[PDB]
């Protein structure tokens, strides 16, 4: 009933090395060598059981927090969140907070988002992509466009007059760099007096100082009468099941969580999308994206992007499908849980790996081939946005952003990969994207 | 117009060594060799101007936050208050929060307290001081008594059905374990994971989970029973809005933290002085005062009708003040007598020092409850001015109920020649715990 452990060859470290050197190869190798889709690996002394069979995805995504907990495994994120916030808070309270954000990101809030986005893309374009052909780093540029377009959508004008996208990014970077992802396996690390923790602290107390100055100016305004909502006001008016409103630091915590969530996954999804579409091997697909946009006004609207872009959407999904930005979703097992024909014991870190599952040959024939036209051959094998009790809550907003960019970008430009092949993914980051140094691309305006 | 700085002779560290070795003696030595009550020391390179002349106290206490600020210096309190609460919030909002607590501790709320307190004290003595004679640590027992009474007064029955005094005391202890008082002088220490750093955060999230569950049960029955929690839940900031659970919680633990230590120390000192043979005269005085009351005390009895017990508690804080050194960051140049204290200095006024100026307090090391300040405003054991203590009433109400109930039924023998030495190594100073073994004798 215990799933097969893969033979340890390297004393205390376990497989931490041959994992990080090549996560996909190493997992595939495991799946084969143990003639089994469900297996256990060792990472610095900790048992990590991987649910690598797509037919078993529901055994990971559906059990409740009390059985499969995210708290313990995602605690290295307390820099982003703040100390008693998101996964660090009790489950009832965690749920309320994420629900408040979730309702702040529903399609019902997008009435004004497409123009917000389009404005910010064009403004980036007509300041950095403004020659008749130039050389840029595409990941970096998309990454900048996405932070700007996210702020424009979710921050009101009063907010952005004090805290523009450039300054939010800068603060966010300072907090982001405090993250030690190895802490999932070596929690001792979260106790080291590292100097990148002072920097994170300093940026958080600066973010809160500014938001507080904003809330005061908002309340002064509201007495002399009284209008226009955003992420902030929205959270600012959430009431918990108990009597009480959120505190500044929880409001702020959810804001930085929302923006960090979006910044990387969406950029990378955009970057990959465009790298794929620009590749000469996918002319047929580029052509299809162009036929899709062909009849659109210069100023797109809600319906253009939500309801009339199913081929750009497939492009995003497929990009995520082939090169998932989140490689391993994780939970600490709190009770023996059945999985396949196996029992996974209390104390195991249990993972489900979009990387591994999205390259299952039954589920996704020719996995390294990018093919928007495709569909999963096994039910619920695509888990790029997760599933279950912790489904991505920003999926729609993310894709709204990827699509609108693809739309605006390709309308006005072509691109040339300065390279024979699409970039190698770079697994050495917390959120995975194409290799930065390989993402230089020549833009070309359009006659 | 600068105050005179004491010669530095240990580079980097400054005077920290020679201050921590003897806070009082070092300070008086400066006060002497510069022939000045106002002077400047150096603590790990940070300027500290002590206002050590009781005549000039008001130049520390009266100015408002915007000139002499407590925020930067009392930041290190975050583990107790929570992020962005009390000393961590913007001035107005802090002021407001502390006014909400103030209103929860005024004399009006004390209607029920005395037979609650006295029930907890008696309950304690009937279980632990239960033989004709026995040995106990008096500091530990006073601490337990103070935690048990403060909870009985400030927490409803329903709250205490989830959290007894034992369990609250633990969680308070886990929060205080993350306090790093040296952070007054090394703020980096507030921005760093240290190994104790997580402890307060686990306790806090526990407490808040409990308060939330209690509140929900409180609102499920709401379709008497007023307490601290319901007080704060009903508070409305000067703008439209209420407190978050996080602030409410912060103010609750701030309150119990403040009261737990200072009151326990005050009681223990008081009982220690009163039990010493050299103070027999004063013990008889306290008994003549107590002898005139019923067995069952009331609000008026201990508040308005016990001026000698109150004198004993005050003279204890006078001799061995629990808070040695009160501080503010100087935000704008301030004149202090003759002398300008420059912007960016830490300005401090020390109750230890002032209560030992001979002009204000002759024979300062003698405990004499009969004495009075000979300089107006010299006693600052409870602070003064914009930040004067708001829990003083409640603190002394507990101390005095304990003194009356304790000496009515018991005598005590100090297992030692002398009143204990104060131990200056804790953040809220009390007598040395190991010197506090005492023998209780049940009377007639
Ligand atoms: C010397 C040896 C050396 C080499 C081997 O030589 N070496 N030494 C050490 N390592 C090493 C180092 C690190 C690792 N990683 C461990 C960390 N893992 C990881 C990744 C992502 C995670 O994300 C968690 C949440 C889920 O969703 C997000 C994101 N999101 C959702 N929507 C949009 N974004 C989310 C949720 C909610 C929110 F509100 C917000 C959010 F963002 C974040 C969690 C864990 C990857 C592997 C492995 C090995 C080595 O390689
Ligand atoms: C080397 C290993 C390390 C670790 C720790 O082992 N370590 N080892 C030793 N030291 C160490 C120890 C001490 C010092 N000094 C001692 C003098 N200082 C000091 C400053 C401010 C204080 O009080 C601030 C407020 C004022 O009022 C209170 C209290 N209150 C009001 N009413 C009733 N109580 C208040 C107010 C409002 C509320 F709502 C609540 C409250 F409580 C709290 C008190 C003392 C710090 C510097 C330096 C270093 C270490 O750091
Ligand atoms: C567009 C690319 C995105 C991808 C590929 C993505 C991916 C994911 C995945 C795989 C999960 C599962 C987490 C787990 O099981 O541990 C997740 C959850 C989550 N995502 Fe996303 N996400 C994206 C965009 C966004 C955006 C824009 C937001 C906006 C804030 C967001 C916020 C969240 C949150 C808060 C959760 C966790 C909710 C919970 O624990 O219930 N994501 N996302
Ligand atoms: C014998 C018992 C007590 C003593 C000896 C004492 C002493 C003091 C002192 C010296 C200050 C001045 C702080 C400064 O100037 O920096 C102060 C302030 C304060 N005390 Fe106490 N105190 C006692 C009891 C309490 C209790 C029981 C509470 C709450 C229940 C309390 C709450 C406060 C608060 C909230 C402040 C200052 C807030 C502000 O900055 O305005 N005290 N106390």
Automatic annotation (TrEMBL), chain A:
| Range of residues in the leader sequence | none
Keywords from UniProt, A to Z, are: Heme, Iron, Metal-binding, Monooxygenase, Oxidoreductase
The UniProt record gives the binding positions of heme as 392
Required cofactors, per record?
heme
Keyword Cytoplasm among record annotations: no
- EC number(s): the record gives 1.14.13.70
The family note in this entry says: Belongs to the cytochrome P450 family.
Instruction: Name the chain's protein.
Output: Lanosterol 14-alpha-demethylase
Provide the taxonomic classification. Eukaryota, Discoba, Euglenozoa, Kinetoplastea, Metakinetoplastina
